Write a structure and sequence with these properties.
Chain A: Belongs to the ryanodine receptor (TC 1.A.3.1) family. RYR2 subfamily. Chain A: This is Ryanodine receptor 2. Chain A: It comes from Mus musculus. Chain A: It is found in: Sarcoplasmic reticulum membrane. This is part of a larger assembly, with two copies of chain A. By secondary structure, chain A is largely without helices or strands. The first copy, chain A, has one helix and no strands. Chain A is elongated, with a radius of gyration of 13 Å.
């Protein structure tokens, strides 16, 4: 975080909500991208 | 929210390392685990900050539990290589941990007892006959990351000194390697070989059962005095066994002695003199193949020996240049191999050259002109060799591509090395 990491607010919640998201599927799919960025990278 | 953010990185993986710990041993858990353990540890680069400064509640009580879960998973039936996540958490432990509150080292101690003597435990004593699950170099390199107290020990010092003494006694008894297949790099196993960190340790422990014999300084001094002739007379012209023996001697009797290094001035000077004279004896031979030492460890006599070796190598390189100027050799494969070997030898020499450049400059700054008079022919030969070269220029790219590891010790001021760096600028500054 170089430019401005000022306000947390929903810091890790967008990824903390579905860090256990790959539990239903068995394999395949293109959702497997990376895991270091997870948990905010720390009408 | 700080405590929640701290515990979400460790308690989650600690709890998740309980179903596959027995399911794998024998739906999409084998696929989501790859994301899970990377989110547990590799998601945060500076996990040591969250361990120490942010919240010390999780700390070792969760880190060692996750490590024990990983060890149990490796004991189970794995399929793919997942060493990156376990190896990327080595320096994050010390930079203490209250091991007395919770002792999560029982599983690691059991594994170490099961693997007490790797040359002697090559049998079916391990469950399910693991051909490559545990009986390989994987656990040997994993012990380097798991056991690392370079900054400061963070243990109860109850089983660690006894284990270190037992391993030292076993290595003293077994002079040769005697390892299994595909386990050549057995030297990088223990990174905490130090005092209190033919032996009579068993008798002393039986008699005490308050103060261990390793606390007294008589035993390490006696061990050092007994091991001094062994590494003093260690000189062989072989390429395989001599190299592995030199690596084993450097690993078991290294310079890492944090127990009052400055107090034993004579011992420190003797160790420095031996560690300076050993590479001279190693490089005294031709040593056409330079791939045996993957990464060697970095007064007037030593400086003179280094200058003489540099002059001899410069003469040899000049002779090779005049030999290759005319009488063209065979196809480009042999020439490329020769150039790659020469570049590897040059990099191996330049590592120690950059290591000793600061000492040479410090010695030559005050009143030493002999070092300058000896280094001037070396700089002249280095300038002449790089004045007009093409084969070395094109092979340097593939040499750097092959060697993905980099040291970059020029910026420390205290492709492993390139042709032009800070050491070259210091040499040319005069």
């Amino acid at each position: 975080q170089k430019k401005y990491e000022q306000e947390l607010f929903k810091l890790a919640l967008p990824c903390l909500s579905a860090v256990a998201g790959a539990l239903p599927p068995d394999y395949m799919e293109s959702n497997y991208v990376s895991m270091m960025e997870k948990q905010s990278s720390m009408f | 929210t700080g405590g929640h953010a701290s515990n979400k990185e460790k308690e989650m993986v600690t709890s998740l390392f309980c179903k596959l710990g027995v399911l794998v041993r024998h739906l999409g858990q084998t696929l989501d685990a790859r994301t899970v353990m990377k989110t547990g540890l590799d998601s945060v680069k500076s996990a040591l900050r969250a361990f120490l400064d942010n919240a010390a509640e999780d700390l070792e009580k969760t880190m060692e539990n996750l490590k024990q879960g990983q060890f149990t998973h490796t004991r189970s039936q794995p399929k793919g290589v997942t060493q990156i996540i376990n190896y990327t958490t080595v320096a994050l432990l010390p930079m203490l941990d209250k091991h007395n509150v919770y002792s999560i080292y029982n599983t690691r101690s059991s594994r170490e007892r099961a693997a007490l003597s790797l040359p002697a435990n090559v049998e079916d004593v391990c469950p399910n006959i693991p051909s490559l699950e545990k009986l390989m170099t994987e656990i040997i390199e994993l012990a380097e990351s798991g056991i690392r107290y370079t900054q400061m020990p963070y243990m109860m010092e109850v089983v660690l000194p006894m284990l270190c003494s037992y391993m030292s006694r076993w290595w003293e008894h077994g002079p040769e390697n005697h390892p299994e297949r595909a386990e050549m790099c057995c030297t990088a196993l223990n990174s905490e070989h130090m005092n209190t960190l033919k032996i009579i340790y068993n008798n002393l422990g039986i008699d005490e059962g308050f103060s261990q014999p390793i606390i007294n300084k008589v035993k390490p001094q006696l061990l050092k005095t007994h091991f001094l002739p062994l590494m003093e007379k260690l000189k062989k012209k072989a390429a395989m066994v001599v190299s592995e023996e030199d690596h084993l001697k450097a690993e078991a009797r290294g310079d890492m002695s944090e127990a009052e290094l400055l107090i034993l001035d004579e011992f420190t000077t003797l160790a420095r003199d031996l560690y300076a004279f050993y590479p001279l004896l190693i490089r005294f031979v031709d040593y056409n193949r330079a791939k045996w030492l993957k990464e060697p460890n970095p007064y007037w006599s030593k400086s003179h020996n280094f200058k003489r070796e540099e002059q001899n190598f410069v003469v040899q390189n000049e002779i090779n240049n005049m030999s290759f100027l005319i009488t063209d050799t065979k196809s480009k494969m042999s020439k490329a191999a020769i150039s790659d070997q020469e570049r590897k030898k040059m990099k191996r020499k330049g590592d120690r050259y950059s290591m000793q450049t600061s000492l040479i400059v410090a010695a030559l700054k005050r009143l030493l002109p002999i070092g300058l008079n000896i280094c001037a022919p070396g700089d002249q030969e280095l300038i002449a060799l790089a004045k007009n070269r093409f084969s070395l220029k094109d092979t340097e790219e593939e040499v750097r591509d092959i060697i993905r590891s980099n040291i970059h010790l020029q910026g420390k001021l205290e492709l492993g090395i390139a042709n032009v760096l800070f050491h070259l600028e210091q040499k040319s500054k005069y």
